[PDB]
Amino acid sequence: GSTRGSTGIKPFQCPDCDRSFSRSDHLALHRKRHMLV
Numbered sequence: 001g002s003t004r005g006s007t008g009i010k011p012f013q014c015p016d017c018d019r020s021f022s023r024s025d026h027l028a029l030h031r032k033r034h035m036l037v
């Protein structure tokens, strides 16, 4: 969505979606879809 461009909730949010993850690991896990679809 859009909370602050791409940096809303949680210290580890998706800079592509504006998601929110409490773990940097889970961030990368979601961002796996941002590699090559």
Ligand SMILES: [Zn+2]
Binding pocket: 014, 015, 016, 017, 018, 019, 030, 031, 034
């Ligand atoms: Zn994302």
